[PDB]
Amino acid sequence: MLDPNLLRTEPDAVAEKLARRGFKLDVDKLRALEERRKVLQVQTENLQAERNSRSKSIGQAKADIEPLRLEVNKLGEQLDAAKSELETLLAEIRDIALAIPNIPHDDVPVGRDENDNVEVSRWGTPRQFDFEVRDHVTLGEMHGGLDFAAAVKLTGSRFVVMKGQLARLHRALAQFMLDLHTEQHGYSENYVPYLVNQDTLYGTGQLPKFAGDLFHTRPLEEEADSSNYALIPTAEVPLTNLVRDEIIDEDDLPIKMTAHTPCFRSEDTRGLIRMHQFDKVEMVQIVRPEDSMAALEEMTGHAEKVLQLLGLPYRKVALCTGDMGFSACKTYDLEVWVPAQNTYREISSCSNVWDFQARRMQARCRSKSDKKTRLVHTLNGSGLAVGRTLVALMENYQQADGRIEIPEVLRPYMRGLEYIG
Amino acid sequence: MLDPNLLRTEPDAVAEKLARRGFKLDVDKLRALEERRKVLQVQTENLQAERNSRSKSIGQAKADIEPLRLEVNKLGEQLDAAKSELETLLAEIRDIALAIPNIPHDDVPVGRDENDNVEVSRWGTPRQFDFEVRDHVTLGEMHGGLDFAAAVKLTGSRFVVMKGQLARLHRALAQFMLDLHTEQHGYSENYVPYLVNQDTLYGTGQLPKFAGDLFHTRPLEEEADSSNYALIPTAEVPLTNLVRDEIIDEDDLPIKMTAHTPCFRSEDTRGLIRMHQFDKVEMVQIVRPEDSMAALEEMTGHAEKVLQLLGLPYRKVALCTGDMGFSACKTYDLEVWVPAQNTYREISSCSNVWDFQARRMQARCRSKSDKKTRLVHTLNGSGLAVGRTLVALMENYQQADGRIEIPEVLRPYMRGLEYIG
Ligand SMILES: Nc1cc(CO)cc2ncn([C@@H]3O[C@H](COS(=O)(=O)NC(=O)[C@@H](N)CO)[C@@H](O)[C@H]3O)c12
Ligand SMILES: Nc1cc(CO)cc2ncn([C@@H]3O[C@H](COS(=O)(=O)NC(=O)[C@@H](N)CO)[C@@H](O)[C@H]3O)c12
Ligand SMILES: [Ca+2]
Ligand SMILES: [Ca+2]
Ligand SMILES: [Ca+2]
Ligand SMILES: [Ca+2]
Ligand SMILES: [Ca+2]
Numbered sequence A, B: 001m002l003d004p005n006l007l008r009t010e011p012d013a014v015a016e017k018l019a020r021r022g023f024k025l026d027v028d029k030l031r032a033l034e035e036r037r038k039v040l041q042v043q044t045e046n047l048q049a050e051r052n053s054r055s056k057s058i059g060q061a062k063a064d065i066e067p068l069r070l071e072v073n074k075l076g077e078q079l080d081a082a083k084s085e086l087e088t089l090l091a092e093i094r095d096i097a098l099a100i101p102n103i104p105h106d107d108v109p110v111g112r113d114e115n116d117n118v119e120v121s122r123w124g125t126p127r128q129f130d131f132e133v134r135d136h137v138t139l140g141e142m143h144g145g146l147d148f149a150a151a152v153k154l155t156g157s158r159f160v161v162m163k164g165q166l167a168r169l170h171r172a173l174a175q176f177m178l179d180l181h182t183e184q185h186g187y188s189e190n191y192v193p194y195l196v197n198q199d200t201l202y203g204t205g206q207l208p209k210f211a212g213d214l215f216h217t218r219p220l221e222e223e224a225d226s227s228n229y230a231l232i233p234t235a236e237v238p239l240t241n242l243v244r245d246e247i248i249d250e251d252d253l254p255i256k257m258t259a260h261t262p263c264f265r266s267e268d269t270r271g272l273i274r275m276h277q278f279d280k281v282e283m284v285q286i287v288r289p290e291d292s293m294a295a296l297e298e299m300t301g302h303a304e305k306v307l308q309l310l311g312l313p314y315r316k317v318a319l320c321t322g323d324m325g326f327s328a329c330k331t332y333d334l335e336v337w338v339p340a341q342n343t344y345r346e347i348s349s350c351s352n353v354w355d356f357q358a359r360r361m362q363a364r365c366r367s368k369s370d371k372k373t374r375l376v377h378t379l380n381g382s383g384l385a386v387g388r389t390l391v392a393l394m395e396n397y398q399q400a401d402g403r404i405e406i407p408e409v410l411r412p413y414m415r416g417l418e419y420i421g
């Protein structure tokens, strides 16, 4: 959600920044709705006041209360009708306001799509192979460890069954990532629900605009009016909502949280690349408004550190205005080298959300003296998407016979094992 | 599913065994449906034969084919009508057959409910405390590590948010359990889908009878006719279905599999005890029919070994006929000591399923020479339910000030940490 006072004072200036994302803000409709809202708001508050006054006259006349009671009931019917008409108009304003993406920060390069993204840095040298590179699907078949056919039998397309040592390696990657962020990077570990409610989804921006990208669960028989849930598309959703409706003491900031969860989306026909269910170790930071740009560089470095310790070459890319996600104001993507595809592929997206989710959640901070609160800033970043790390690990460390060399940093997580196979 | 030939030859003998569970088999309705099925089956196969013959006469007359074509279309309409009437009757037989629980093995003590279960063994001595025992909810509040209120905000009742060292300890328990079963007990690790289809749910017995105990997801826009999924209530569902429609070489048996998954059910108002989402390390065995009773003792010992290495006192209980789950033919429950409740509480259920799920899945085995296949037997057991292990660990190892002593066997999983707090 953008600042409603910013939409009322500078609508054309806001529409200009949003045009860089390719978003056309309907300024004309927002103005006509807002002018009609002020007319209905005055009419409604006048009815609220006269009804309140007419009912006080009843208690004052108790010292015939029937002619006064009829008037109070007509005023009550008129007030409810005016309140419903007003609420219908407020919901139309909300339908527009809650579908507006975040305003891009000035640091973001202007661009129309992913071909306009700017490479910021590169690390490591892609391996030169002495044989024909096999992809992760072929490697998983050779080991009997990645089985897409069994997952189609159990469920359907875009799911996987991992078996044996490759399932073990996938678990080891998550253990290493969680240990790195909690032991070296200052994040606190969290176990979160994988089903969340509508308030949580509105809070992080998935609702109202991206309902179709979620798996929704039908309400339960015994919780019929309070169980309209959806599976989490990322741990960013439950983690960021932990500060919803909170006033945090600024001394307690930053709040740095991590979690390893499955992620569920219904948004590459072959492999672990774009599945409906995938594991991801997520990093979330809740910070003071002035520290969010520095916290973005810090969190991006925490994700880069995972790729560096694993020996996986990668590139850091600043997303342009046209390639950013809905709630981000600034994003860096990390793209890992994938030898069978001869290119870098996205493995992490690190964003500064500014106060866009804090506005929806009412997440604020305050100094003990300060007579006023302030919205916090929120940030989220993959550190990393675990299945994509397994793809990169398998392809970059494959041997001529298909054996997988286990990166040195993961060997304590595999009981010192050097190779799978 | 029970053997259909056993329901046709010994219906009263089957009804007698099922009566021990408190299940009344409607023998009279099954017989009347089966007699009417034989009438419709003869009438249908006679129509299939005459239609097949009448269409062959068309090709033979190509050497006027209009009087013969009209007859073929009337026969075709009569055959389709007879096939639909027959299929409606087959579905009524299926509605009865697929709701019948498994026949209890003779080893199972006869009983009406859980108060008739038989204690088989006991291990360890419940700790005598020098202070008033705190429950896991109070301990989690003192540490700030178990937060039920935050989970109600994110989702609703019967969910939890774990934070900091207690989330870390919960992860350490799962790591230890998976490492024990894969390193010492011969199980192969699996990563499975957490959403499964209707065939999978019918295969393990959740459908048709227990649909109301599952979270169901609405079909996806782009997969409208192939995405009616449900969240897994246990890893037994995807793991056991890995052998659906397979003929396994008997030399490859036993197939021993383990997985750590969240579990989702909508079946203790306070705590981690009965939540809609809980983690569990599951053990599944697919074995030859003659080895299933020995494999049950082996798998129960693998679950008991977890409690023993963790130093948690427990009791092993043989469930009576009236307290067994739907698909089990024989079950042992392990009940861990819970000091705040002054009793043992269920933490594992280990079952021999016999051929009941193998019948539904068509999972069979064969020796290379053997001219005929045989249904395998399946088994499943908790090793263990992770949140209940955390409950027992917290309460049994709490110190007077609320600190949690980390069991010796988990300390390598916590970087040598001795106490939380
Ligand atoms: N996003 C993606 C989509 C799909 C479609 O179901 C399959 C994937 N399997 C792996 N990912 C990986 O998930 C990462 C994070 O996703 S993101 O939407 O860009 N960003 C977030 O969710 C933020 N909370 C920061 O992590 C991406 O960088 C991608 O590599 C997939
Ligand atoms: N079952 C249970 C139900 C609920 C209600 O949502 C919450 C729970 N939180 C922990 N469990 C634990 O899950 C264990 C296994 O569940 S079972 O249905 O008995 N058996 C199976 O699922 C087999 N596949 C063997 O594991 C039980 O022993 C119980 O301690 C819960
Ligand atoms: Ca501080
Ligand atoms: Ca974001
Ligand atoms: Ca992106
Ligand atoms: Ca063998
Ligand atoms: Ca069972």
Ligand SMILES: [Ca+2]
Residues within 6 Å of the ligand: B323, B325, B333, B349
């Ligand atoms: Ca039970």
